[PDB]
Design a protein around this nucleic acid. Structure first.
Ligand SMILES: [Mg+2]
Ligand SMILES: [Mg+2]
Ligand SMILES: [Mg+2]
Ligand SMILES: [Mg+2]
Ligand SMILES: [Mg+2]
Ligand SMILES: [Mg+2]
Ligand SMILES: [Mg+2]
Ligand SMILES: [Mg+2]
Ligand SMILES: [Mg+2]
Ligand SMILES: [Mg+2]
Ligand SMILES: [Mg+2]
Lengths: 87, 46, 95, 72, 201, 122, 95, 242
RNA sequence: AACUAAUCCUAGCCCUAGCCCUACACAAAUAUAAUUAUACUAUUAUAUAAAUCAAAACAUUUAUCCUACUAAAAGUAUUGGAGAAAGAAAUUCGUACAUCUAGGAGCUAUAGAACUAGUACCGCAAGGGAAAGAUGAAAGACUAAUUAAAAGUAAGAACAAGCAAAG
């Protein structure tokens, strides 16, 4: 006998069918799309501008940053006041 | 007295108490019929 | 306790143990003395000092506490400025 | 017409001749051509019951082919 | 019925009813499936026995039980039995044939008497005909007497049997009228009343 | 103790219980407990005259059976309607409105024998 | 309306999932019943002159029951929407 | 054996086959989409993060809507998303007391409401929340027109919306006849909500109503094959003459 | 020198894989006391699952039951008569054999489906629910053989004395 051809992983970018109900949800997110570009680069067909945050998304990131991540000067000033209160 | 003769047959009573029209009158009775259909009973009701 | 959990199929820690005892990596367990915060106005000074101390657990108690906790609580933790840094190891122990 | 009976099945209904229209016939109107929600659980059970029968029949054919090829 | 076993006795006969009662649950016989196209053996075909007690002896088919892939040859593969036995008398000794499976015989070339394997192929007219694999030739379908015993040529019809001409006479005249309308007009019935409106539901 | 598998018929049950055996009604029960048979409701057998008829129950075994060709709407249409329309089309005297001229029936109402819904028995 | 809060914490479900609830998540406590709140006033622009409220076109704040029961239903007043505000404002300026 | 599809996808599959598939695309969008109604019986979390007071750490928080029971009577009224809360309580409000069945019932009122687009006064069972929402919407017509299906939560409410939308879509002169100027003013005031006549027809219909509507649209008596064959014959004969 | 019996192998079943479905298969009859060719007399699911049980009692509470992608984060954070127990997410990973209808260190008649059958039979009813079969290529060859072989008997009752045997 001759053995069957060796099993191989499917090559190239893979875009699942959106309409098909069976197709798993996780494969249709933008997160999945970006992963195709990372592995296969240009041949993925992803428009690179999509990889970066969109202007509405950019505002959300900046809004989140201000609330929870203060600037160095504010951090220093608050620490200074606490020492004075302790002193 | 001697027991064991509690069945006193009467066709009018039998069909009124356990018949087709009686079973379909209430949803609980209809579900009785559905159960017997799913089992494959030859006799769904009296 | 739970040996095989429904969701993950794993052993489960008894959290009442984690809330009362400290495990040193060498295998020892630390605990407080029962009653060290109770009715101090009628206890002798030497008695109060004995109560305040941190105390070790016996071999059987250590074996039980090992069964009631999972491996995550037995690992090495490299805490900066750890006050128990020196007590996670045994020195000159021949036995 | 194609109608759903009270048991949740689809059956062809043969019409009968009457001298009055359907909305004025009290005997006819008492007949129900709809199924209430308590029937859906039974509808699924029939589908699953039938699916088991089909699965066994297909398996048995495959088993029977084994005997033929082994024998011949 | 799944447990029915096809035998030499014709189905539905007294012998078959005795053999195949409703309660019989005998082990199924395994038969190699053969398509209607695949089968090439027919009653009246001369065939040769490849192997067995009568290997190499040519015979004529007289019965075919397709459900068992059987072909029965007249006067061959024959054992002995007593027919018509009764309490008083033994009966008459006869030689009884046994069924032969399809692969145990081969069809015979007509001009040269040899066991030629054959292949199915169409003809100019389009009629399907068996052709020999080697020495390509047309092996015609043989003619066998009708099972019921009716010989059409010798048949002479008695009363209650339509004559040929009468059966083949054409009287139909296509028209958009039902049998009911045709008969009433032919029979001269007159009806001017009409059914009142009926509601179907 | 009752028999559930046997059929429910009028022989069983009390005298008050009655039901038919499938015979079609031939009349009406009026008030005063009177049966009134209707002549029209009683089926009448239309029997032809069999004198001189050449067809008998059986056929000659020598009579060839024909190739089976079940009748279809197209086959009926070609035999009956096509020649008339074809002839009229050549003469040019054809219009959509007068399909009734060739045998079309716009409606079944008013016919003694209606094709749908059928109003006559076999 | 009635506003209720669960006694028992519900574990988080994640972005694309719905939490699976249990019998204990059906036990509630009453945070508030809106019936007992202090009641706001409702603002209308009059379409006529009605006693003790003002002349046609005035802007008033009235009890909600009074506004709905009489002013709105009887046609005396109209809702003080921005579109209504603009129209009546123009009329007064011309007047 | 196993079903090919998970049970939760069964409804979607049916909408994709049969007479359901022939329904208009816009109508199916309303059926397919699942949108959560505005919170009524619980306070939503203002932020997506809060500080857990015990350990002082930022923790993600989610809104879990309270299950609310909507009686069939509510479909004959315009409750402002309110419903029956079927739940449990702890006697004396302590976790260590008995668990008691508790039902919180909305306070219902009967009120008269006037629709300008329909020029009709309806008697409706209503809650104080609905009256407040109508005030926020600047009129009964605006409340019905603006509010979505989920928040409206009434088959009667959806039925009213279809009437208003169809009235606007057709610019029907049946509104205030003999006063064309008043009719125009009302239509102009609500001009923002105008949509195509075809879409307005299917607004608020249930799936069963839609299937009956579609069945009626496509209902037709079969064509006598006499006509069909004649058309085929005439075309062939006409072509031959050409 | 044998009776009662015993032997047998396939009917089918089990679990996966794959796959949505679209079968809804004469006439007539039937919702009336179903299966009765026509009028009388109108027609319509349910508010939260509970308890057993665990907590060595029980009274808040007790995984699955009461489903929303795998593996990891993690039995961690958190929740809990802070007891018994319960228990995430953020965040990372995953193209699943693809192709056509395949596969078995699965069962072989007390097994494997309850199934030869939801039958017989039992129950007023809801409901419960069995048992079994075996010739050969041919029976259009008289229905096959094979086996000191189970218990039980027979062929062949017994003969002072005893856990019935052992020396
Ligand atoms: Mg008894
Ligand atoms: Mg009595
Ligand atoms: Mg996650
Ligand atoms: Mg207990
Ligand atoms: Mg006790
Ligand atoms: Mg107890
Ligand atoms: Mg309890
Ligand atoms: Mg068995
Ligand atoms: Mg059994
Ligand atoms: Mg013996
Ligand atoms: Mg002795």
């Amino acid at each position: 006998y001759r053995a069957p051809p060796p099993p191989r992983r499917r090559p190239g970018p893979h875009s699942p069918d959106p309409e098909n109900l069976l197709t798993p949800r996780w494969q249709l997110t933008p997160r999945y799309v970006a992963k195709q570009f990372g592995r296969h680069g240009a041949i993925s067909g992803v428009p690179p501008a999509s990889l970066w945050p969109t202007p509405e998304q950019l505002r959300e990131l900046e809004a989140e940053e201000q609330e929870w991540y203060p600037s160095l000067a504010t951090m220093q000033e608050s620490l200074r006041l606490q020492q004075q209160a302790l002193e | 007295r001697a027991r064991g003769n509690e069945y006193q047959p009467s066709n009018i009573k039998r069909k009124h108490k356990h018949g087709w029209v009686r079973r379909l009158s209430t949803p609980a009775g209809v579900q009785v019929i559905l159960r017997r259909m799913l089992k494959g009973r030859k006799s769904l009701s009296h | 306790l739970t040996y095989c959990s429904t969701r993950k199929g794993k052993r489960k820690t008894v959290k009442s143990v984690v809330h009362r005892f400290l495990r040193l990596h060498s295998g020892l367990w630390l605990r407080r003395k029962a009653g060290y915060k109770k009715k101090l106005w009628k206890k002798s000074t030497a008695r109060k000092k004995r109560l305040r101390e941190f105390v070790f657990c016996s071999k059987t108690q250590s074996k039980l506490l090992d069964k009631m906790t999972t491996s995550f609580w037995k690992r090495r933790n490299w805490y900066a400025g750890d006050p128990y840094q020196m007590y996670h190891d045994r020195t000159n122990l021949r036995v | 017409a194609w109608r759903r009976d009270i048991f949740g099945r689809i059956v062809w209904h043969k019409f009968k001749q009457w001298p009055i229209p359907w909305y004025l016939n009290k005997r006819y109107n008492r007949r129900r051509f709809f199924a209430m929600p308590y029937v859906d659980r039974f509808i699924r059970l029939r589908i699953e019951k039938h699916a088991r029968i089909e699965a066994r029949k297909r398996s048995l054919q495959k088993k029977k082919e084994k005997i033929l090829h082994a024998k011949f | 019925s799944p447990f029915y076993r096809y035998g030499m006795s014709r189905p539905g006969s007294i012998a078959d009813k005795r053999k195949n009662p409703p309660w019989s649950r005998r082990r199924p016989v395994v038969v190699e499936p053969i398509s209607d196209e695949d089968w090439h053996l027919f009653c009246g075909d001369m065939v040769e026995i490849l192997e067995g007690k009568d290997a190499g002896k040519q015979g004529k088919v007289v019965q075919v039980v397709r459900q068992r892939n059987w072909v029965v040859l007249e006067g061959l593969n024959t054992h002995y039995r007593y027919i018509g036995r009764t309490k008083d008398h033994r009966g008459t000794m006869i030689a009884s044939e046994a069924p032969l499976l399809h692969h145990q015989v081969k069809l015979v070339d007509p001009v040269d008497r040899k066991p030629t394997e054959i292949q199915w192929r169409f003809t100019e007219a389009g009629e399907r005909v068996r052709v020999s694999t080697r020495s390509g030739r047309i092996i015609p379908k043989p003619e066998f007497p009708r099972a019921d015993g009716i010989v059409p040529e010798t048949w002479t019809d008695g009363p209650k049997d339509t004559s040929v001409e009468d059966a083949l006479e054409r009287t139909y005249v296509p028209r958009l009228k039902t049998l009911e309308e045709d008969v009433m007009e032919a029979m001269g019935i007159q009806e001017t009343r009409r059914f009142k409106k009926v509601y179907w539901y | 103790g009752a028999d559930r598998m046997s059929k429910w018929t009028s022989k069983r049950g009390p005298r008050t219980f009655t039901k038919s055996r499938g015979a079609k009604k031939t009349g009406i029960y009026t008030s005063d407990r009177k049966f009134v048979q209707i002549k029209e409701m009683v089926p009448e057998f239309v029997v032809p005259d069999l004198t001189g008829f050449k067809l008998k129950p059986y056929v000659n075994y020598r009579a060839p059976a024909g190739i089976d060709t079940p009748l279809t709407a197209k086959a009926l249409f070609q035999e009956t309607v096509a020649p008339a329309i074809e002839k009229d089309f050549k003469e040019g005297t054809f219009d959509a409105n007068n399909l009734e001229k060739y045998g079309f029936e716009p409606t079944q109402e008013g016919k003694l024998f209606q094709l749908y819904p059928k109003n006559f028995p076999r | 309306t009635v506003i209720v809060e669960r006694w028992w914490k519900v574990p988080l479900a994640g972005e694309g999932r719905k939490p699976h609830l249990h019998r204990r998540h059906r036990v509630y406590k009453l945070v508030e019943d809106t019936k007992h709140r202090p009641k706001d006033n409702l603002e209308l622009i009059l379409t006529q002159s009605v006693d003790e409220i003002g002349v046609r076109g005035d802007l008033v704040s009235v009890k909600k029951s009074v506004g709905r029961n009489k002013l709105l239903s009887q046609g005396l007043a109209v809702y003080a929407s921005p579109e209504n505000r603009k129209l009546f404002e123009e009329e007064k300026s011309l007047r | 054996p196993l079903h090919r599809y998970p049970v939760h996808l069964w409804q979607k599959l049916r909408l994709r086959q049969g007479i359901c598939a022939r329904l208009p695309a816009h109508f199916l969008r309303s059926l397919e989409e699942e949108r959560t109604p505005t919170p009524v019986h619980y306070k939503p979390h203002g932020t997506k993060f809060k500080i857990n007071p015990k350990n002082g750490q930022r923790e993600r928080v989610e809104d879990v809507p309270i299950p609310v029971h909507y009686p069939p009577e509510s479909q004959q009224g315009l409750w402002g998303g309110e419903g029956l809360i079927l739940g449990y309580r702890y006697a004396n409000n302590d976790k260590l007391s008995k668990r008691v069945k508790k039902v919180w019932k909305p306070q219902l009122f009967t009120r008269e409401l006037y629709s300008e687009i329909l020029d009709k006064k309806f008697t409706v069972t209503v809650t104080m929340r609905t009256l407040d929402l109508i005030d926020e919407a600047y009129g009964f017509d605006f409340y019905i027109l603006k509010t979505p299906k989920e928040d409206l939560g009434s088959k009667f409410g959806m039925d009213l919306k279809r009437g208003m939308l169809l009235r606007l879509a057709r610019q029907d002169p049946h509104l205030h006849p003999e006063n064309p100027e008043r009719r125009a003013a009302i239509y102009d005031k609500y001009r923002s909500f105008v949509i195509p006549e075809a879409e307005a027809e299917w607004v608020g219909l249930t799936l069963e109503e839609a299937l009956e509507k579609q069945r009626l649209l496509e209902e037709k008596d079969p064509v006598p094959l006499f006509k069909v064959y004649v058309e085929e014959l005439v075309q062939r004969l006409q072509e031959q003459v050409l």
